[PDB]
């Protein structure tokens, strides 16, 4: 399993494979592991689909639950405050074999530069949590060779169309060289599930796009 | 990693599949796994390249030692005895992590009833040995749905050909329920290897048969 | 002990076989192991006679005390997730020797098209679960050659009397190989059972309709 | 696995079941488990096929070297005696989990009263041995079941043809209660082996009597 | 420590770091790893600098002996088969926390085609030999970032300038992402060494090459 | 990791360098580890980001909720106190694996002699405190190579200029003995980060000037 | 207990201090631990009195051994290959509780610069041997801070008296940093012990010019 | 660390060393471990800093609450109930590796002979308390060795001067013996502690006092 | 147990005590310690009876053999080797409960100065020896006791009546400190027994002078 998120002038994207593996079975070809939480943000947990969809339940749920409140969303530094309070109030249960490291990727619509206001948030086992600086990150078992990926072709992003292959690409190199991650399957017709955040919100990316890039991407390997 | 082995009638024929792990990380795309170790038999070891090829190197020279003292080979039985012997004397190894199941096949030459000369015999961890009667065999990882597989498509077989494709489909069958075998690949080109052996010999099956014969299952399934 | 569940157009069937096991003794020849919860849910918890009749006893009256208290039954989510609740408050007892995974069938009578309404369920040991999209499910310790016999088989199914032969089938083939499942005994005349939900709500299905069946098959395969 | 040996006026005879498992998948279906030692003699062993036909073969050669060296046959104690040291000299291993429990059947020849001389020993762990004196004994994982139903039975065996009659509905009774004993298969036409040994030596019992046998034992209990 | 090879038309190329450490204090700055082993060969051990001097110490004496005892040099399937030898007989001492995997590199002056003649042969812990045919490989602690390097970068590998450069960024690349590898150190004047093998024979590139070329990927990459 | 601080006449300076690591894999390369938590002191923790930022902003919210709620500051002794309370509440998951030792720097405004009134507080695991009189401490795993160099170079220290350039070196010395710290990154542009606390309060020191001061130590060095 | 050595132009100097520790308690005042083994080279053992002098007494009585057989001395490759087989012929003691770590100081005769002949070989634990490129090393518990005074005292290293000088005020650092080094005792009058190694030989410096040195020391820091 | 205490007529004395250490490493230099208490008492921890501070602090709290809330200061044997008590309530922590044992020393105002007024008081881990009386007491690391040279020097007190000259001497007789323990440092200027207790109360002794007569014992040892 | 040695002018002295413990029962009151093992050496193990003569045996037989052999008697560092060697010989027992470790006392008559002839050795565990250079040494469980009883009677230690006070005055201190120690039985009249080496050999002291010296120091205590 692997999630891959990256910056691009504007905005942020998010994207994931779809594999689920007990061992070496494979137990699911489907599983969709980002989710939108709310208007500005998306969150992306490396597991099995029930703790992905779970762990994103929550988070919006208490998100939702401030806005009804107070009557005003909380800031993107809330959020993170929030988030990690949610993941460290687990690290018993993650050392006891029940682990979920959650990927964050948010639009900050109060930044004074809008070109630069994408985010893009990780956190470690204890808790901890880090905002990024390079442009990219991964999480997961193929998140080295994403990274490694990602280090290379960051020269080519200039904008939303140029982030989604390049992500895409990403994950489709992870697969190359990890064998819990899946690729393309070009007979069942099952692609990654991508979101894009930019000023006007947060969307799901349609099908046909991923399945017309990850096209693109065999053709240009073979 | 998977080895099949099935009769039919004239001969036998065995194939395996390409990918070598090292826990979920791809280490070898084109590992051959089945070796020619007489005029008449082939034997495939689950395992790495190393390991099958040592072995199948160790098996061929004990058997071409025998034939060159005694001038004349030996007979089925006492091949099978000398490779139970090799099998038995690595238990302890095998249980210290070093554990290599073989999978034989032959042509029996002094067999009244040439249509039914074809041989398949499996090993255990402990050294024991059995002769198949079902008419098929797997070994490895993706062995169970290798053998689900070849247990509804044996009823196809009639000849050499229907033999190779249903072994090509059962290899595909266990590639798609387990992440240690390796499907076809069609970006790189890299296909499973197969060896016939009938009245005539052991021979390598060529390249493009099998690519063909994976090709018109890919579009079969789609 | 196996429990198997497969869509067809318009409704979903599930069936189980009758065997229980200490060890390698025969416990029980009768055991039910499916059970009608609501008028159009059903539950196969693979294990004793005792904990399939407790659960779905215990998961029956939630179900009706909401139904009761509130004036309409629950949407098909609320009852997964009333269902997740209840198999992740025993994961201690699971690991301490005492696991019970359900598998759901059900008919969602709030779906656009009545032709796909029917649902299927299943739940990992940490409480996890998955709503399935192939078409067929199957738990227990002969799960795995079911699934790879329905894999094969459910081309040929496109009505309910098509799904109760494949599932009949897929239970003889798990039986064939495994032997904590029981075969159909005619000596006896003890067969599977089987539930069949459709727009009219789940039924059993009359013990004669698969004994005949049964009886096919087993000509069949002579 | 089960082997049941009884006797009868004027010879005995031994038989078993044909199946071989690994935990609770069935391995094999047509596993001989009795062989033919030497021109009075049998021996059974509860395992696999190649452990059976191994101590068989060890101790044949045994007894045909003695008998070219010193030209007469053993007699039936010093059989019995060499047996017992082969036994004994595998402790530690079937301690390491490799245990092999034989069972012997054979005919005396240089006993004073035909009618009684035919004989059965049985083994323990630490390799004791103990000729039997009530008339029937049984090694196996369904040995208890069998040995009882043949208490019941007895009083009929009043010659070779009730005794092999017995031996069959004993291995039948231990099928019923034990799992890992395999019954008769109507299906793929495979049926339990047996050996009689009277004054004129061990034979083999032809598969069309044993299958008679048991299709009558099937249509009693119906 | 990371060694690195690679394929270019007409030769290879092998080169690695200079840094040693005991956990995560540096203990060398100046360790050669790379060693002319024969005319033809060199050997590349990812550890300290006794070890590896050691080893191709060993393996050249084995070399020169064979040749001065036989009058001609070994093939390259001897070499690979010496090498898998004395890897072998160190598994028992590797388990004791001292493990020494080497990586080769060679030039086959009996091959047909001498544009394709270079050799890579890399070991496991086990004992077991791959011959590579991708046309990279690296070893030690900063490998993977290395490979995943040389993957984006060996289209522009046209010959032995290019290949050179090509190792000198991954090892910068597995220095920039792995602390225990040493990147070029611009204030003591330390750079990785190098040696190529063509047609010619194995000779040591010059410091003021690789110098050359670590200042300009440098300046590109700032 | 390691953090610096060292007294000048008229006041402190404090540094720290800006790596993070997991093991031997650099996963941060711009960590800021001093942050100022009131008008006269700084504290650095020697660890990961959100640990230092975390530590930092619950003992700033001590310290401002007691100014808000007394109308005045604590005294030097009572953040000393405040600051041990909240270091010893974390024994035991310090012992757990998560220990956070930190280093406190301030200016005493009570103090009879202004021209000493810099202080600096050091913490152990157990809870203990000191203050220091020899005029500077380190923290970290580099800390016994800064301490080192400060021994040598402190007899330079006249004034601020003097004092944040001995704190550069000390800490280019650490990184250059110990693998865990990082040294200053001229490709990238990213320098340690100091802060100056004196008569009129604690002010962060721009990067330029760390930086033209880095590049002096370098060039010396060359 | 700590050895420093350290090369100057034309030869290199070798010293050590004088304590001996069980614990915290001190055994020993007067513990001399450089012995010279050769008309040219020295070695300094750090531990007890009798370890020095018996692993000295052994190598001392090789090398004449040698020289007696064969006519000539050993080459300093040679010299070094010897000891580092000593060495390693006690890993498994070491790792009992009885480690000996030596530190080698020589003049090498046949090298084409005489004012660069000096020599320092340091060992590890595991037997590996490194020759030393920045000009000098320390071995014991007080070496790291040694080390670190060397690194600012070699400026001002130019001939054999600086190089002395230098060498003792990095043996006062390391005792004024660890408690079981020793430092020089004015009240009972003992110095470290010292060897000068020249293109003369190794010679043994007199206890009145370390003592003038030591106290010289001893009034500059004061 | 030591400390000792010792009577002479009219009062008592006590003083300690000023080194912590961190197992061989030297970790402070100017460590004070005894307080005055109250008008008429001292206390003396062997350890770190912190803890005698701590203890100390808490204890003198402790007595100026009872004399404030009573009206009256408790009596000698309340005094050492109240330690007792605070003693006591750590031995659990004591046995985790954090164990303090004081030592008391006082003036008893309400005895009737006020030349022998004077009293020790030691603490076991336990808890225990004993009254001493031979006139002197020693606790740390270095107790041994001071108390064998008290045993001898304990025959020269007669008053105040004498008493102090003799624990002085105690002291330095213990640093001779014991690494933990510092003695005086003549380059850095630092001596040991002490305390006078008589009529009219606690004191501190002047540092050029203790200068002056440790300049003394060591022109002696000399 | 406690034996004791010192140096005066002119020779050597030694003496232990008299008592044996199992536990804290007192199993021995006139063990004898120490023995003459030739012409100028005496030995004494702190032990049983047993040990003590059994090692005073083997030593004194080899030391007679050289002796025999050779016609000339071993030099003194002859005599420490072969002492070293039968003490290092028995480490594995000695860790198994069995340690004995004794203390030589000498006369050296090939010396050029006469009257610092004497020689005082020990032994630790590890095998390693010392010779002593304070003048006194002591071993056993009171051992920490006599030598810092020794370090302040020594001065008046002129000649051998002195040096025989001053031993048993040693004596004396450690039994009063150490209860596994005996001190002199007036009840009984046992007291410490001793042997002075001088120029004219090694003899043992009557008893009547050690009970008049250990009478005057008990009137002197009084």
Chains 1, 2, 3, 4, 5, 6, 7, 8, 9 share one sequence.
Not at 92 to 114: E, K, R, T, V
């Amino acid at each position: 399993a692997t999630i891959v998120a990256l910056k691009y002038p504007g905005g942020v994207v998010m994207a994931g494979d779809r594999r689920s593996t007990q061992g070496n079975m494979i137990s699911g070809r489907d599983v969709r592991k980002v989710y939108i939480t709310d208007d500005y943000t998306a969150t992306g947990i490396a597991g099995t689909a029930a703790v992905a969809v779970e762990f994103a339940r929550l988070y919006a749920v208490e998100l939702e639950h401030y806005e009804k409140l107070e009557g005003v969303p909380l800031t993107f530094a809330g959020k993170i405050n929030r988030l990690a309070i949610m993941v460290r109030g687990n690290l018993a249960a993650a050392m006891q074999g029940l682990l979920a490291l959650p990927l964050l990727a948010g639009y900050d619509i109060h930044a004074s530069d809008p070109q630069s206001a994408g985010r893009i948030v990780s956190f470690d086992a204890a808790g901890g949590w880090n905002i990024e600086e390079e442009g990219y990150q991964a999480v997961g078992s193929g998140s080295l060779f994403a990274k490694s990926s990602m280090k290379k072709l960051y020269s080519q992003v200039t904008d939303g169309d140029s982030g989604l292959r390049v992500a895409v690409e990403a994950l489709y190199d992870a697969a190359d060289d990890d064998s819990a991650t899946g690729g393309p399957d070009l007979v069942r017709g099952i692609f990654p599930t991508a979101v894009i955040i930019d000023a006007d919100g947060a969307v799901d990316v349609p099908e046909s796009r991923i399945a017309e890039l990850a096209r693109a991407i065999i053709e240009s390997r073979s």
